[PDB]
Design a protein around this ligand. Sequence first.
Ligand SMILES: Cc1cc(Nc2ccc(O)cc2)n2ncnc2n1
Ligand SMILES: [Cl-]
Ligand SMILES: [Cl-]
Length: 182
Amino acid sequence: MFYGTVSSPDSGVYEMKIGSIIFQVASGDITKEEADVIVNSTSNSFNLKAGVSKAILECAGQNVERECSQQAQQRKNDYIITGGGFLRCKNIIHVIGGNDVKSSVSSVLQECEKKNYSSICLPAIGTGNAKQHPDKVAEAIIDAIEDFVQKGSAQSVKKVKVVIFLPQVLDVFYANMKKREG
Ligand SMILES: Cc1cc(Nc2ccc(O)cc2)n2ncnc2n1
Ligand SMILES: [Cl-]
Ligand SMILES: [Cl-]
């Protein structure tokens, strides 16, 4: 009803259509990517500096770190939106790695529509310090995008890319795409 065909547009990159959205996966360093939004997978205090969160906060810079701690003390947040700092993006959305991954991705998609953004890049949310299982994380990410498409909510959002630290986790995402393809 929604899924296109899995193919490889460049070496190590795999893509398929989900409704109107191009969904892509690749292994690499997320801090070198360009997108309207980059997603950080962090702790409930928004000040973790381990694994992918270390790279994102170090590259983004101290003003973004400052933004995070200030919003954390203002209220209880399920996620926080900051500037991009020295990353190549318009905003960073910082989600909690231990939270429900489908819910976190659904929130990212809705916030990107609110800003009329077209591109998103995210890590394998929850597979770092939170130690959620890669198979469940892949299923949750793709389920969130399917639901967003099914509800007719995709308007500005055109491209969602997962850039993944470990090649072994990329294999799990590829297998999930092949399970779903038309
Ligand atoms: C050991 C390790 C390293 C690393 N990131 C990285 C650092 C330096 C490079 O040159 C390449 C990748 N990450 N990210 C998440 N967990 C990690 N664990
Ligand atoms: Cl995590
Ligand atoms: Cl990752």
